[PDB]
Symmetry: C3
């Protein structure tokens, strides 16, 4: 006879007064029940959220069901036996609009991602009709979004849609991506057309019809960059130009998240097919009780024979009114030979600016990175992942300069905070555009005083203490402008050609051990005034030819009391305490004057206290006394 409700209160406690609402592929059904019951004092908290459905009799003894979730409950003034309620049914999938989070999914295909969302909320009542092997996303992010909003966006990108199968006590999100996911309802594989201007016909019929068509873009071209293939023409274009005029206007868009071109192809195909799904649609209305969204059904008895086609019900509106039945539906078909595809209804979240984030890596490591300088990151909004190498995509790091091998490298280390930023705000395409200090990652130089101290500083990777650092700090405090270069072990330097140094005043070089200097040709050292050398022991001058000492006033050789002296006045003192000249052959003396011996005119040696080892070692050790 008529419709009866299937509900936890017992089908007899509630009986439908009317029905409203509708359905659409990839969009939540929405059914405004209106019903009456003998109790005005029904606790709506018992109804609300709970599963409720309808039994609608079909001819041939079939039944149709409209199971769903009570998202709104309401009651309205009516006679006491017939207290009126206006429950809205929604799918369990609608409850995913009642929850939000931020969560990262990695190395998962979107069918696997969605089923994680469903299964974590206990929503088991889903089913798979998908036919493509979908891409395994390296990294997906739910961000500032509901679980339904995220879910819908992912399907819309891949061009998945969903439609529902309704049982007595279950309603099932069937995931669908092809004609083959659709089915023809028994006995409604054809629906006749018979107008309301006929006498009221015995079966179910489409009573009204309105074909509609629209100009829709004939092609889409998509590009994305790939830093691993920056030369590669990732550009891919999909085309379904229509026969009609203006059927060829092309669209173009930039970053389809795809990176492999053969994935982007289908992102284009779906984005066009969704608009091609608008190029033709067919309104109908009628009594097709058996038919539902995503069902198929041939048309019969239509006058325009182009319309005697198999149709895909993209959307339905339903009406029932009932006595204690009149059934009506209003619906939009498309030609089943054109694949449906959902629009980008589900507006993506975009991060309208940068993020901060801890850098992370394996528990014992200090840096975790790859051949492009990417890093793993823990976002401060991520609740779910353990702040380790699994907590992000490999994220590229910007560098102050970067070229073909060459350029500046400043690899951010584990625990360092970074300024992330997304390739369009797209949470799925992070990139790092800065590093930043914080009360943990403290500043090198205490800044309210040392604000003038610029320059880099390091800290040895593995277990580096604050004292194990290279540095090139640079203070330009007026009256204290200091360069300070530090190597915590060694400072190699190479120059292919010429060094220079130019120092207005002083230099102190301390070599706490040993210096080698190897000169390939020449040295030339020049002093305006004074040199000193001091040596606590020995000096050797392996001069392979000539050593010429060109003194101007006094050479004074010394060793203790033994003293050779050359005055520029030509007086020589060779005087000592014992002497033993020797020659294997001749020896001589000559004078233009008169050599004589023991004259007593030379009274003594020219000892001046120089060369006394005690002082000389002391003067050579003088820099190296203990602190």
């Amino acid at each position: 006879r008529l419709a009866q409700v299937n509900c936890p209160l017992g089908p007899d406690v509630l009986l439908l007064k009317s029905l409203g609402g509708g359905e659409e592929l990839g969009r939540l059904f929405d059914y405004q029940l209106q019903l009456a019951s003998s109790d005005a004092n029904i606790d709506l908290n018992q109804l609300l959220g709970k599963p409720m459905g309808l039994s609608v009799q079909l001819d041939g003894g079939g039944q149709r069901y409209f199971h769903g979730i009570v998202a709104r409950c309401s009651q309205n003034i009516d006679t006491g036996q017939f207290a009126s309620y206006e429950v809205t049914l929604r799918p369990w999938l609608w409850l995913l609009s009642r929850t939000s989070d931020c969560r990262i999914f990695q190395n998962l295909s979107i069918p696997q991602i969605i089923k994680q969302v469903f299964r974590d909320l206990g929503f088991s009542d889903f089913e798979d009709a998908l036919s493509r092997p979908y891409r395994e996303w390296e990294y997906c992010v739910q961000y500032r979004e509901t679980s339904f909003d995220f879910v819908s966006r992912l399907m819309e990108q891949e061009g998945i849609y969903y439609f529902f199968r309704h049982e007595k006590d279950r309603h099932v999100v069937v995931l669908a991506d092809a004609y083959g996911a659709h089915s023809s309802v028994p006995g409604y594989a054809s629906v006749p057309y018979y107008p309301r201007d006929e006498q009221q016909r015995e079966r179910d019929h489409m009573f009204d019809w309105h074909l509609a068509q629209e100009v829709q873009p004939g092609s889409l071209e998509l590009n994305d960059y790939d830093f691993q293939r920056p030369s590669a023409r990732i550009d891919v274009r999909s085309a379904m130009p229509r026969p009609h005029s203006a059927g060829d206007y092309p669209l173009y868009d930039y970053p389809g998240t795809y990176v492999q071109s053969s994935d982007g192809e289908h992102y284009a195909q779906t984005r066009i097919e969704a608009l091609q799904s608008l190029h033709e649609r067919i309104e109908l209305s009628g009594n097709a009780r058996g038919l539902g969204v995503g069902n198929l059904f041939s048309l019969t008895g239509f006058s325009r024979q182009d319309q005697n086609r198999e149709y895909l019900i993209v959307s339905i509106r339903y009406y029932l009114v009932q006595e204690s039945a009149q059934f009506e539906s209003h619906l939009t078909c498309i030609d089943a030979q054109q694949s449906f595809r959902p629009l980008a209804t589900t507006h993506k979240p975009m991060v309208q600016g940068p993020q901060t984030a801890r850098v992370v890596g394996p528990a014992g490591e200090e840096i975790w990175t790859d051949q492009y300088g990417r890093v793993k990151v823990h976002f401060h909004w991520d609740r779910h992942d353990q702040s380790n190498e699994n907590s992000s995509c490999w994220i590229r790091v910007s560098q102050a300069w970067a070229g073909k091998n060459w350029g500046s490298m400043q690899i951010p280390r584990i625990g360092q905070e970074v300024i992330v930023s997304f390739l369009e705000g797209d949470p799925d395409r992070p990139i790092i555009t800065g590093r930043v200090y914080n009360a943990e990652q403290t500043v090198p130089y205490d800044l309210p005083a040392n604000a003038t101290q610029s320059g880099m500083k390091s800290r040895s990777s593995k277990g580096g203490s604050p004292a194990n650092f290279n540095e090139i700090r640079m203070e330009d405090k007026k009256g204290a402008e200091q360069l300070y270069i530090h190597a915590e072990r060694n400072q190699d330097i190479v120059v292919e050609v010429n060094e220079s140094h130019s120092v207005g005043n002083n230099r102190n070089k301390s070599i706490g051990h040993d210096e080698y200097v190897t000169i390939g040709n020449k040295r030339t050292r020049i002093v305006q005034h004074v040199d000193e050398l001091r040596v606590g022991e020995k000096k050797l001058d392996s001069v392979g030819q000539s050593y010429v000492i060109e003194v101007g006033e006094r050479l004074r050789l010394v060793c203790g009391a033994s003293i050779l002296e050359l005055n520029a006045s030509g007086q020589i003192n060779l005087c000592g305490v014992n002497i033993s000249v020797h020659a294997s052959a001749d020896a001589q003396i000559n004078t233009g004057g008169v050599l004589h011996l023991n004259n007593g005119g030379g009274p003594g040696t020219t000892t001046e206290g120089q060369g006394v080892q005690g002082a000389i070692s002391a003067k050579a050790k003088a820099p190296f006394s203990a602190p």
Copy 2:
């Protein structure tokens, strides 16, 4: 009897034909008057924007008022005595949607911020019922927003709402945040229910009713980062789970502007309570002339005894039609035991990308910064603040590298332009992600020529001239690849272990004064071919043991004419002009040949012009002649 208008034209000049519109908590009232007057030639500029109100008689001789601001004026075809006008009333607070600016508010609580907005526009007609001590925001920004849009967002974040008190000639924005701000209207503390199916009842009654309920999220969890507490679990969760099924679906969101966790708690509480305010609401309609938005009123005579409750009028629609009255209202209550809280209706402005901004600080300073390297900033859009240390929050600066103390520091100085950027686009959370040159902050190296000159440069902080700089510029112009390091005073260098230098050709080191070199063990200098030393005065070799000179061909000591010479052929010349050998004890000569004296075979001294002081000082001074 009926309603009369209160207006500057005189209450008798305008008389109401009808009324429309409604009210809602935290949202502007909106009242479509329709009225008639004997003048069709009313200058609407006189009406428009001006304060106008209604007097509505209440039983017991009371009056109700609907004072407001004429936001729209209109006239429409009618009989001459009854020229018809369709004035819309809006609040004075609505005029804040007619003004926009950008302005920064700092160290102010949102109640103080709003009253600044009101008081600056002269809108004195506001009032305070707030009960919480609100957080003192360190920094708030009106940006790309109206004064109403900004105002509403701030209240919605704190979970403030407002409702109006209407006088004859004033209407007052009452700020409200608790049940206690509401009041019970005299004589309408209860309203009976009596249906239209009763005979027309003598008092004021609710004639219709529709309870409604919705599934709403049972909890919200909020996180924000804090660079001053980056380890701290700022995470805070608020929960109000419902008894019904699906009453526990949790929400999560990231950055609530809060930083202190106990502030974020109430941001969650309000965001849930606003949705809990949707979990139950009660439509009514009836003649409750006395009741208005934010009033309280018990219900009586309802059948379902759960409904005999105190109710909070969250919203009202009003109708009057009049003769020269029929009053109707349609309204939504909530149960007064549940706190109202406004939704996030007021979409926040987000800066969809970075900003430029001058750096600023105290008038005599050059850098103004804190222990984390934050700075004050003058935004180019800020009109109101004097480009000093008060013109911003302490803004963190990104650095090319940053770690635990260690890392690169590049503190931006006063007058320098920076690339700002916001933690989500949120103007209240700026951060700096770059520095940039401009025609004032000119580039170091004139770039159309010197594009190859890389590297840092400095300029002494206090009063540094362009010549007072450290530098490490780095040109890789092919055929001119130059390192250039400069210290405007001193270049300290340390190496914990080993230096190296490796120079393919030349080195020039000039020490314009004095060099000390202190070697803790050994030196070893080696020359393939030639050394020279020149000294304008003195050299000292304090060799504490042995000095051995190992010559291979000719030692030639000299001082003027005095010359000692050692040839490797074993010939020695010790010849001078005067000589005086001396010994305290013996002396000797020996020959295997035959010593004899004045042979005349040695004809002369070996003078070669070496050691003549005039040349030697000159050759040592030769580098140091005047330019």
Copy 3:
């Protein structure tokens, strides 16, 4: 008599049943035809997109046309001879909403830009009534936008609008920016008012009227920055305060893309005039068949004599119903003395985050930049431009530090990838906030091993090999902390005052050729233990005064067998193989002991194998043997 369709099927094949729709300045007309034809089997692909129009008879034998583009086609149930169709007409300009791209326009005025968009799509049917000489935008970007959406935004910024001229077979987008672009339709230069309460009047008349007015902001002030004029008060304010109260509330907004202040003036003027266009508008309805959007027409016979004015039809709705006529229009005028100006209806695209982009320049160059360090860029989404110096605005580059001349420079070179970012997301205001490596622009140091290697590296500009680089790499691998400085030619160094070096152990300095050292005063070298010098040839000590050698244990001069020795024990050996002392005057010996000769107590020379040239040259050459 009535209306007949002008269509490719022949005006007799289709005849109008009714008409709907309307028009608005700067907005696309939209006309829901309803028509009937003897064929239900009309291929809609023939109708769709094609040009179709109406002929409407005007009195005095005139005709009105409504040519347009069939954007939607539809058919609906009707009698066979009268199969009903519901074609929607849209402008050809509407097809620009059916195409999208990203394209950059440079050094073009917006009138030139738009005509490029039109002319590239073949849409010739546009016309120019513009009166201002518009600014020549340096750089405009279509991004994530349709060609209509982009087009509309550009006109709305300049405050251009458009209206249509309709022919039989053409409809023309007239670009308009002043009253003078409007025209008065013959015979409708005045339209009488005569109410429906009159007997049906013989001519065309406005049958109804509703004046409306609104509070609208009295002024707008605009600012933008200019890095070429960062001191300049680019601030410009436009004002049109109304006489009424609240007629002076000012708006302020930041970045009007203008840079020259006199351009920004008109951006304000238009943004206010558009809102001033809302301050007054006049609804009408009536039979003004001749009048259309953007037409002018005086009013006559109105009672309120303020309304007997010239009016500008800002918008129209049309209705026809027809027999085989009743014409109706509903319209909004403004007073023609107030310039119309379109609202910011067309929401701008904003880049909600950064972009990557290749750097580019002239084909033979390596760097292309200007006196501010700007660069040209090829965006990865740009399809149209050849990746050269024409492919972008001069884009500023952020630098890690930047000041008055001084600061760090890191000029990104041709082929380098950069992180772009926009001044608000505004695609017309790009800026670069980072550089990034990629599989082409490879990282300097192979990072999975060398992650510890920090520091800059270069690569000679013109044809630099990987070996032609300056470097300052900095490894802090624990137990290997290395500084490494490299100049591919020369390393100049200056210090204004003092150097220091402090090396815990070793130093090796190799000078592969020649070292000069020039000391302006003093040197002081001190060795705890040992020095060596080795020289393959010669050493010279031009000591202009005294050389004093202060030995402590043994001076041992040598040249082959010739040996002078000074022991600190006072024993001297002066012994050789031949000797020839000589003096121009006296010579002496003296002893306190007893000189005697050939005693045989000195048995031999003190030869020790030192000074043998073969060894000595070898020991000086020892560092320089072949590898």
